[PDB]
Amino acid sequence: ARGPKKHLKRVAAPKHWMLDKLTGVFAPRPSTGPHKLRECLPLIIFLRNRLKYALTGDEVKKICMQRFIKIDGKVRTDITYPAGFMDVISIDKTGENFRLIYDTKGRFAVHRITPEEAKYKLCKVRKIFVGTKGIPHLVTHDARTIRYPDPLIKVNDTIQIDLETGKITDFIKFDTGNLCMVTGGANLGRIGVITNRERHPGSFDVVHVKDANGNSFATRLSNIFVIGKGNKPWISLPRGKGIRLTIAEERDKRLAAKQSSG
């Protein structure tokens, strides 16, 4: 290739998008933006494929160009815009607010929130540095550059951002005993309390996380997102509450449902 690529094939698209084989040869290639190509949900696959407000890709454009969808408080008319983890989608015409939160199976969930909860979001801390004339600067997982933060905030922490002003209202440090969600790997979508962190200098750290039912797993430190302080999350949680059911337990829980029906 002599330059950057502009297409995406449907079998090469991220599996959690849940795209079928026989609709087309191509998939929406996400625009460049705050979230990565393989860790985002474009607006077309959310308005058309998940919410079914539109039947074709031309109808998504007609909804978008009417300026109905706000991503974290700003109107986006791009139909392949890379929305991602912890983002807030607001449709004012129907009065709906959604937050992009992984479910236990590793896929983005349709998680509706209240108008009050849509006024803030939680952001991980990626980089801290000092810029010209000694001004501290943050860089988050949302590609947000926030200057003059508290000196107690360090890398791998979580901050709360008010979407109207874009300023930090509170923060949670990274330490054992704090709630977290896994945002990658094989435990994606799982919620649990940090119990240990083993350090491997010159390589990747490992964090051990225990569920509410007593199941323990481990992840790389880059795949951990601190949610709340202690056992209490700072955001509303999806239906599964982060607990991964086994296939036998899931089978029994599904079979018990149809017996209830009658």
Partner: peptide
């Protein structure tokens, strides 16, 4: 904007520097 944001961190930097010196002065004797 610059002079309102620069004058608020200076007030919040003083508190964080002051609370971080008690933690040192107390520990030296103990």
């Amino acid at each position: 904007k610059n002079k309102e944001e620069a004058a608020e961190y200076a007030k919040l930097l003083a508190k964080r520097m002051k609370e971080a010196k008690e933690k040192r002065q107390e520990q030296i004797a103990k």
